């Protein structure tokens, strides 16, 4: 297996380090490479390194910022990034490469770690009623949305969170219902955010 670590939140222009440790094979004899994936886009190859660290190959656009190395004694693979830019948030995978049929192919991928670079602080989710439930301006990516603490489960469509220019996330949650039940029960949207402890049960007024 290949276990990766070092991901998290780093300010723009900082210095960051990722680690990939291997257990289950000979770490000494295998070429290893780093691959990147942007949110919602295709794959991208960061770098490649040989066994004794003699042949190091780098991405055409990423040259001059990324420095890769490995420790064969501790079975570890380290990557260092300096002068980070805002579009350097992504998922990083450390892959093991094998040569066969006169060709390089990656035969084992790690779990992959997330790295986020942004200029923002912890901000609470603003909850608004849509008549629907809109969550706006919360910095950490994960947030929980529910209808009456899981009471309703039919037609509950959520949508992927997006980035606006301000640097804070926003999403929406909707529901389907026939005509009558509008005037029977008043409904509550539950929005939960942990890194600031906001568990808001906001009411909607039909109109």
């Amino acid at each position: 297996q290949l276990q990766e670590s070092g991901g998290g939140l780093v300010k723009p222009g900082g210095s960051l380090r990722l680690s990939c440790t291997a257990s289950g094979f000979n770490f000494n004899k295998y070429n290893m490479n780093w691959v990147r994936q942007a949110p919602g886009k295709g794959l991208e190859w960061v770098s490649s390194i040989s066994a004794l660290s003699t042949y190091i190959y780098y991405a055409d656009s990423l040259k001059g910022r990324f420095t890769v190395s490995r420790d064969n004694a501790k079975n570890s693979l380290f990557l260092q990034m300096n002068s980070l830019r805002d579009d350097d948030t992504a998922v990083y995978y450390c892959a093991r490469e094998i040569r066969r049929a006169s060709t390089w192919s990656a035969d084992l991928w790690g779990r992959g770690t997330l790295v986020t670079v942004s200029s923002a602080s912890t901000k609470g989710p603003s909850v608004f009623p849509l008549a629907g439930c809109l969550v706006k301006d919360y910095f950490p990516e994960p947030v929980t949305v529910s209808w009456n603490s899981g009471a309703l489960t039919s037609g509950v469509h959520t949508f992927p969170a997006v980035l606006q220019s301000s640097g804070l996330y926003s999403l929406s949650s909707v529901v389907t219902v026939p005509s009558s039940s509008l005037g029977t029960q008043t409904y509550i949207c539950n929005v939960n955010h942990k890194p600031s402890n906001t568990k808001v049960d906001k009411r909607v007024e039909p109109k």
Partner: peptide
Amino acid sequence: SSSLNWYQQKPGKAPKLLIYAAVNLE
């Protein structure tokens, strides 16, 4: 020549080889 690898990736999961050497099978 014959240098191409085919990968398949599921949402939120690391990819996996399907084809190596552009004609063989993993």
